[PDB]
Protein backbone atom coordinates (compact mmCIF):
# COMPACT_ATOMS: atom_id res chain seq x y z
CA UNK A 1 0.00 0.00 0.00
CA UNK A 2 1.15 3.54 -0.78
CA UNK A 3 -0.25 4.49 2.62
CA UNK A 4 1.72 1.91 4.66
CA UNK A 5 5.07 3.63 4.19
CA UNK A 6 3.43 6.97 4.92
CA UNK A 7 1.69 5.57 7.97
CA UNK A 8 4.89 4.08 9.43
CA UNK A 9 6.41 7.47 8.69
CA UNK A 10 3.86 9.35 10.80
CA UNK A 11 3.85 6.61 13.42
CA UNK A 12 7.60 7.16 13.65
CA UNK A 13 7.37 10.94 14.02
CA UNK A 14 4.46 10.96 16.44
CA UNK A 15 6.38 8.35 18.42
CA UNK A 16 9.46 10.55 18.29
CA UNK A 17 12.10 7.98 17.45
CA UNK A 18 13.74 5.78 14.84
CA UNK A 19 11.56 2.88 13.67
CA UNK A 20 12.93 -0.14 11.80
CA UNK A 21 10.51 -2.64 10.29
CA UNK A 22 10.74 -5.69 8.08
CA UNK A 23 7.76 -7.93 7.33
CA UNK A 24 7.97 -11.09 5.23
CA UNK A 25 4.66 -12.52 4.00
CA UNK A 26 5.34 -16.15 3.21
CA UNK A 27 2.08 -16.21 1.23
CA UNK A 28 3.65 -14.42 -1.72
CA UNK A 29 7.17 -13.76 -0.37
CA UNK A 30 6.36 -10.09 -0.35
CA UNK A 31 7.98 -7.74 2.12
CA UNK A 32 7.28 -4.45 3.83
CA UNK A 33 10.46 -2.59 4.78
CA UNK A 34 11.02 0.66 6.65
CA UNK A 35 14.65 1.53 7.36
CA UNK A 36 15.10 -2.18 6.78
CA UNK A 37 18.82 -1.77 6.06
CA UNK A 38 19.85 0.34 9.07
CA UNK A 39 21.52 -1.08 12.16
CA UNK A 40 19.56 -1.22 15.41
CA UNK A 41 20.64 -2.42 18.81
CA UNK A 42 19.31 -5.96 19.07
CA UNK A 43 19.01 -6.06 22.83
CA UNK A 44 17.40 -9.27 24.07
CA UNK A 45 15.98 -10.10 20.62
CA UNK A 46 19.55 -11.28 20.12
CA UNK A 47 18.72 -14.22 22.39
CA UNK A 48 17.13 -16.12 19.46
CA UNK A 49 20.48 -16.34 17.65
CA UNK A 50 22.35 -17.65 20.67
CA UNK A 51 19.78 -20.37 21.38
CA UNK A 52 19.61 -21.17 17.67
CA UNK A 53 23.41 -21.46 17.74
CA UNK A 54 23.16 -23.96 20.61
CA UNK A 55 20.39 -25.79 18.71
CA UNK A 56 22.56 -25.99 15.62
CA UNK A 57 25.33 -27.55 17.74
CA UNK A 58 23.11 -30.24 19.26
CA UNK A 59 22.55 -31.49 15.70
CA UNK A 60 26.22 -32.51 15.75
CA UNK A 61 26.39 -33.45 19.46
CA UNK A 62 23.59 -35.92 20.23
CA UNK A 63 22.75 -34.56 23.64
CA UNK A 64 24.21 -31.10 24.27
CA UNK A 65 20.77 -29.94 25.39
CA UNK A 66 21.03 -32.19 28.47
CA UNK A 67 24.46 -31.13 29.63
CA UNK A 68 24.12 -29.41 32.99
CA UNK A 69 25.48 -25.93 33.65
CA UNK A 70 26.44 -24.42 36.99
CA UNK A 71 24.53 -21.39 38.24
CA UNK A 72 26.99 -19.57 40.55
CA UNK A 73 25.62 -16.81 42.79
CA UNK A 74 28.40 -14.85 41.13
CA UNK A 75 26.66 -15.45 37.79
CA UNK A 76 23.58 -13.36 38.63
CA UNK A 77 23.22 -10.13 36.67
CA UNK A 78 20.49 -7.50 36.52
CA UNK A 79 17.63 -9.77 35.35
CA UNK A 80 17.68 -13.45 36.50
CA UNK A 81 14.10 -14.72 36.99
CA UNK A 82 14.82 -18.43 36.43
CA UNK A 83 18.57 -18.88 37.10
CA UNK A 84 18.19 -17.33 40.55
CA UNK A 85 16.12 -20.40 41.40
CA UNK A 86 19.14 -22.62 40.69
CA UNK A 87 22.09 -20.84 42.28
CA UNK A 88 24.51 -23.49 43.51
CA UNK A 89 22.61 -25.78 41.18
CA UNK A 90 22.68 -26.37 37.43
CA UNK A 91 20.47 -25.93 34.40
CA UNK A 92 20.59 -27.80 31.12
CA UNK A 93 21.23 -25.92 27.92
CA UNK A 94 17.65 -26.83 27.03
CA UNK A 95 16.58 -25.17 30.28
CA UNK A 96 18.72 -22.11 29.67
CA UNK A 97 17.50 -21.61 26.06
CA UNK A 98 13.96 -21.90 27.31
CA UNK A 99 14.60 -19.53 30.20
CA UNK A 100 16.37 -17.06 27.90
CA UNK A 101 13.70 -17.15 25.19
CA UNK A 102 10.58 -17.17 27.32
CA UNK A 103 11.57 -15.04 30.36
CA UNK A 104 14.45 -13.08 28.83
CA UNK A 105 16.69 -14.38 31.62
CA UNK A 106 20.00 -12.56 31.32
CA UNK A 107 22.12 -15.24 33.03
CA UNK A 108 20.92 -17.91 30.61
CA UNK A 109 21.89 -15.71 27.69
CA UNK A 110 25.36 -15.40 29.18
CA UNK A 111 25.52 -19.16 29.57
CA UNK A 112 24.43 -19.68 25.94
CA UNK A 113 27.09 -17.28 24.72
CA UNK A 114 29.58 -19.21 26.83
CA UNK A 115 28.87 -22.64 25.38
CA UNK A 116 29.06 -21.52 21.74
CA UNK A 117 32.35 -19.78 22.44
CA UNK A 118 31.69 -16.11 23.07
CA UNK A 119 29.85 -13.49 21.04
CA UNK A 120 32.16 -13.70 18.02
CA UNK A 121 31.27 -17.32 17.43
CA UNK A 122 27.56 -16.59 17.74
CA UNK A 123 28.24 -14.08 15.00
CA UNK A 124 30.12 -16.84 13.18
CA UNK A 125 26.94 -18.89 13.31
CA UNK A 126 24.98 -15.99 11.79
CA UNK A 127 27.50 -16.04 8.97
CA UNK A 128 27.00 -19.77 8.42
CA UNK A 129 23.37 -18.79 7.86
CA UNK A 130 24.41 -16.26 5.25
CA UNK A 131 23.57 -13.38 7.60
CA UNK A 132 26.29 -10.78 7.06
CA UNK A 133 24.80 -8.06 9.25
CA UNK A 134 24.25 -9.61 12.65
CA UNK A 135 27.05 -8.98 15.15
CA UNK A 136 27.07 -9.98 18.80
CA UNK A 137 29.88 -8.15 20.61
CA UNK A 138 29.18 -8.13 24.37
CA UNK A 139 27.65 -10.15 27.21
CA UNK A 140 24.64 -9.48 29.37
CA UNK A 141 23.88 -6.92 30.65
CA UNK A 142 25.98 -4.43 28.69
CA UNK A 143 24.96 -5.58 25.19
CA UNK A 144 21.67 -3.68 25.64
CA UNK A 145 23.29 -0.23 25.86
CA UNK A 146 21.73 0.76 22.52
CA UNK A 147 23.95 3.87 22.57
CA UNK A 148 23.14 5.53 19.22
CA UNK A 149 25.61 5.39 16.36
CA UNK A 150 27.29 2.44 18.11
CA UNK A 151 27.37 -0.66 15.86
CA UNK A 152 28.07 -3.21 18.56
CA UNK A 153 25.40 -5.87 19.08
CA UNK A 154 23.28 -4.55 16.17
CA UNK A 155 21.70 -5.85 12.97
CA UNK A 156 19.17 -4.71 10.37
CA UNK A 157 15.44 -5.47 10.17
CA UNK A 158 15.92 -7.10 6.77
CA UNK A 159 18.72 -9.38 7.98
CA UNK A 160 16.91 -10.46 11.12
CA UNK A 161 13.62 -11.20 9.30
CA UNK A 162 15.27 -13.35 6.66
CA UNK A 163 17.32 -15.08 9.36
CA UNK A 164 14.31 -15.64 11.63
CA UNK A 165 12.41 -17.10 8.65
CA UNK A 166 15.35 -19.42 7.90
CA UNK A 167 15.37 -20.60 11.55
CA UNK A 168 11.66 -20.96 12.38
CA UNK A 169 10.38 -21.87 8.90
CA UNK A 170 13.36 -22.62 6.66
CA UNK A 171 16.06 -25.26 6.92
CA UNK A 172 18.84 -23.50 8.86
CA UNK A 173 18.15 -26.08 11.57
CA UNK A 174 17.13 -29.71 11.33
CA UNK A 175 13.47 -30.51 11.65
CA UNK A 176 13.63 -31.36 15.37
CA UNK A 177 15.60 -28.21 16.33
CA UNK A 178 13.36 -25.94 14.24
CA UNK A 179 10.32 -27.32 16.06
CA UNK A 180 11.99 -26.80 19.43
CA UNK A 181 12.83 -23.16 18.73
CA UNK A 182 9.23 -22.49 17.67
CA UNK A 183 7.81 -24.20 20.74
CA UNK A 184 10.13 -22.04 22.86
CA UNK A 185 9.29 -18.77 21.12
CA UNK A 186 5.63 -19.75 20.95
CA UNK A 187 5.90 -19.98 24.73
CA UNK A 188 7.39 -16.54 25.39
CA UNK A 189 5.90 -14.74 28.39
CA UNK A 190 7.23 -11.25 27.63
CA UNK A 191 5.55 -10.34 24.32
CA UNK A 192 1.94 -9.58 25.12
CA UNK A 193 2.34 -5.81 24.70
CA UNK A 194 4.58 -5.64 21.60
CA UNK A 195 4.01 -7.14 18.11
CA UNK A 196 1.25 -9.33 19.53
CA UNK A 197 -0.82 -6.40 20.86
CA UNK A 198 -1.11 -5.19 17.24
CA UNK A 199 -2.56 -8.38 15.88
CA UNK A 200 -6.00 -9.99 16.05
CA UNK A 201 -6.26 -11.80 19.34
CA UNK A 202 -6.71 -15.11 17.51
CA UNK A 203 -3.39 -15.25 15.65
CA UNK A 204 -0.63 -17.43 17.11
CA UNK A 205 2.63 -15.58 17.82
CA UNK A 206 6.11 -16.78 18.58
CA UNK A 207 8.23 -13.76 19.47
CA UNK A 208 11.30 -12.55 21.34
CA UNK A 209 11.20 -9.07 22.87
CA UNK A 210 14.14 -6.80 23.49
CA UNK A 211 14.68 -3.63 25.46
CA UNK A 212 17.59 -1.44 26.38
CA UNK A 213 18.96 2.02 26.86
CA UNK A 214 17.66 4.99 24.88
CA UNK A 215 14.08 3.74 25.08
CA UNK A 216 15.01 0.91 22.74
CA UNK A 217 12.04 -1.44 22.35
CA UNK A 218 12.28 -4.43 19.98
CA UNK A 219 10.34 -7.56 19.03
CA UNK A 220 10.85 -10.23 16.39
CA UNK A 221 8.08 -12.66 15.73
CA UNK A 222 6.87 -15.51 13.55
CA UNK A 223 3.08 -15.29 13.17
CA UNK A 224 0.53 -17.91 12.08
CA UNK A 225 -2.80 -16.18 11.39
CA UNK A 226 -5.73 -18.51 11.24
CA UNK A 227 -6.24 -19.82 7.69
CA UNK A 228 -3.17 -18.00 6.35
CA UNK A 229 0.52 -18.50 5.62
CA UNK A 230 2.83 -17.27 8.38
CA UNK A 231 4.48 -13.88 8.56
CA UNK A 232 7.92 -12.94 9.85
CA UNK A 233 7.83 -9.52 11.50
CA UNK A 234 10.83 -7.61 12.88
CA UNK A 235 10.11 -4.29 14.63
CA UNK A 236 12.96 -2.28 16.14
CA UNK A 237 12.42 1.09 17.77
CA UNK A 238 14.93 3.44 19.30
CA UNK A 239 14.91 6.84 20.97
CA UNK A 240 17.29 9.81 21.30
CA UNK A 241 17.07 10.42 25.03
CA UNK A 242 19.23 7.96 27.02
CA UNK A 243 16.54 7.62 29.70
CA UNK A 244 13.53 7.66 27.35
CA UNK A 245 10.97 5.14 28.53
CA UNK A 246 10.07 1.92 26.74
CA UNK A 247 7.39 2.12 24.05
CA UNK A 248 6.08 -1.36 23.43
CA UNK A 249 2.88 0.19 22.02
CA UNK A 250 4.94 1.61 19.16
CA UNK A 251 5.76 -1.95 18.11
CA UNK A 252 2.09 -2.91 18.31
CA UNK A 253 1.03 0.03 16.14
CA UNK A 254 3.76 -0.87 13.68
CA UNK A 255 2.50 -4.45 13.58
CA UNK A 256 -0.98 -2.86 13.28
CA UNK A 257 -0.02 -0.78 10.22
CA UNK A 258 1.76 -3.60 8.35
CA UNK A 259 -0.87 -6.31 8.80
CA UNK A 260 -3.95 -4.19 7.88
CA UNK A 261 -5.21 -6.27 4.97
CA UNK A 262 -3.94 -9.71 6.07
C1 LIG B 1 16.17 -8.27 26.78
O1 LIG B 1 16.31 -7.45 25.91
C2 LIG B 1 15.09 -8.13 27.87
N1 LIG B 1 15.52 -7.45 29.05
C3 LIG B 1 16.85 -7.33 29.58
O2 LIG B 1 17.79 -7.85 29.06
C4 LIG B 1 16.92 -6.48 30.85
N2 LIG B 1 17.98 -5.91 31.18
O3 LIG B 1 19.17 -6.04 30.44
C5 LIG B 1 19.75 -4.77 30.22
C6 LIG B 1 15.64 -6.28 31.70
C7 LIG B 1 15.56 -5.28 32.71
S1 LIG B 1 14.00 -5.40 33.38
C8 LIG B 1 13.46 -6.68 32.40
N3 LIG B 1 12.14 -7.29 32.47
N4 LIG B 1 14.48 -7.01 31.57
C9 LIG B 1 13.97 -7.17 27.50
N5 LIG B 1 13.32 -6.64 28.72
C10 LIG B 1 11.70 -6.86 28.61
C11 LIG B 1 10.89 -6.10 29.68
O4 LIG B 1 9.62 -6.02 29.58
O5 LIG B 1 11.46 -5.55 30.67
C12 LIG B 1 11.37 -8.48 28.70
C13 LIG B 1 11.60 -8.97 30.12
S2 LIG B 1 9.98 -8.90 30.93
C14 LIG B 1 12.27 -9.20 27.78
S3 LIG B 1 12.85 -8.08 26.76
Residue numbers in the entry: 27 to 288
Reproduce passages from the article.
Cefotaximase-Munich (CTX-M) extended-spectrum beta-lactamases (ESBLs) are commonly associated with Gram-negative, hospital-acquired infections worldwide. CTX-M-15, which belongs to hydrolases (EC 3.5.2.6), cleaves lactam carbon–nitrogen amide bonds rapidly, deactivating β-lactam antibiotics. To understand the mechanism of CTX-M-15 activity, we have determined the crystal structures of CTX-M-15 in complex with two specific classes of beta-lactam compounds, desfuroylceftiofur (DFC) and ampicillin, and an inhibitor, clavulanic acid. The binding pocket of CTX-M-15 for those β-lactams was established by the residues from both the α- and α/β-domains, surrounded by the catalytic residues Ser70, Lys73, Ser130, and Glu166.
The complex crystal structure of CTX-M-15 displayed that the DFC molecule was also covalently bound to Ser70. Upon superimposing the structure of its apo and complex structure, obvious conformational changes were observed for Ser70, Asn104, Asn132, Asn170, Thr216, and Ser237. The carbonyl oxygen of the acyloxyl group in the acyl-enzyme intermediate was again stabilized by the backbones of Ser70 and Ser237 in the oxyanion hole. The carbonyl oxygen atom of the amide group in DFC was within a hydrogen bond distance from the backbone and sidechain of Ser70, and its nitrogen atom was also within a hydrogen bond distance from the backbone and sidechain of Ser237. The thiol group attached to the cephem ring showed a hypervalent interaction with the sidechain of Thr216. The bridgehead nitrogen in the cephem ring showed a polar interaction with the sidechain of Ser237, and the sulfur atom in this ring showed interaction with the sidechain of Ser130. Overall, CTX-M-15 showed higher catalytic efficiency for DFC and nitrocefin than ampicillin and ceftiofur.
